[PDB]
Design a protein around this ligand. Structure first.
Ligand SMILES: Cc1cc(=O)[nH]c(SCC(=O)c2cccc(S(N)(=O)=O)c2)n1
Ligand SMILES: [Zn+2]
Length: 257
């Protein structure tokens, strides 16, 4: 029953998931002026050439594009990470209006949407074990602004009408996630959490400084999805973002400047 409505949205989550008020919750506002440059941070290594997408799923909260993570085919390493993390899925958060939708903010600015490419640390052998560990996940976050279309997004947008409602899925092979990346891999990083229940404090966040542009029509199509199942009243899947959480005792590190 958690979700993003008036009665079960983010401000309610702590009653089922008390870690919602924990010490390393996400997202957060990224104060660009107070981010610490760390000249010992390494370039991020994104190795997506052998990625294998499988399926796209409407889970009732967002849509996931899922990958075969049974081998080291699409991996993230380097950057602030020790060892190697396997891509398991990506998804987005977005708004009802172009002026909101991102989970992280930059100097309090909201983007129209945010892409999360979720990876798990191979030393834990699977995603369900990894989320129980403080260094189990590496989530690469990329902001979306509305402007020119992103052509490598259009395969995703065009399949959405087949997964409109909660529970629907569709085969989704040969999707190349390199088409969703901006030119620069400059990033911020900080230790945080999943941004939806169960809110587990298992994530190394890596947030790219450069947003990708998508067109207004591409984001409009995300807003035609539904939170409800087929044959239930229509509740459009919009504003599926958690607001910024207290930074507490954390420092955001920058790979640049
Ligand atoms: C329950 C389940 C089964 C599975 O096979 N795969 C997954 S992937 C879960 C996931 O990627 C995710 C789960 C919750 C939150 C976030 S976020 N917004 O990037 O912090 C990501 N979940
Ligand atoms: Zn997410």
């Amino acid at each position: 029953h958690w979700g993003y409505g008036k009665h079960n949205g983010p401000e309610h989550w702590h009653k089922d998931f008390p870690i919602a008020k924990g010490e390393r919750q996400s997202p957060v506002d990224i104060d660009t002026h107070t981010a610490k440059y760390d000249p010992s941070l390494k370039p991020l290594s994104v190795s997506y050439d052998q990625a294998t997408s499988l399926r796209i799923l409407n889970n009732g909260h967002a849509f996931n594009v899922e990958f075969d993570d049974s081998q080291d085919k699409a991996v993230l390493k380097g950057g602030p990470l020790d060892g190697t993390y396997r891509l398991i899925q990506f998804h987005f958060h977005w708004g009802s209006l172009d002026g909101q939708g991102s989970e992280h903010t930059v100097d309090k600015k909201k983007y129209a949407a945010e892409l999360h490419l979720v990876h798990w640390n191979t030393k834990y052998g699977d995603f369900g074990k990894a989320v129980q560990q403080p260094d189990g996940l590496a989530v690469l976050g990329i902001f979306l602004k509305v402007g020119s279309a992103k052509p490598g997004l259009q395969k995703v947008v065009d399949v959405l009408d087949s997964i409109k409602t909660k529970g629907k899925s569709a085969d989704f092979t040969n999707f190349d996630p390199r088409g969703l990346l901006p030119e620069s891999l400059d990033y911020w990083t900080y230790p945080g959490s999943l941004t939806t229940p169960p809110l587990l404090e298992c994530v190394t966040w890596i947030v790219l400084k450069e947003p990708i542009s998508v067109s207004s029509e591409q984001v409009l199509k995300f807003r035609k999805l539904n939170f409800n199942g087929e044959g239930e009243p229509e509740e459009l899947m919009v504003d599926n973002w958690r607001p910024a959480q207290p930074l507490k005792n954390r420092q955001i590190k920058a790979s640049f400047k």
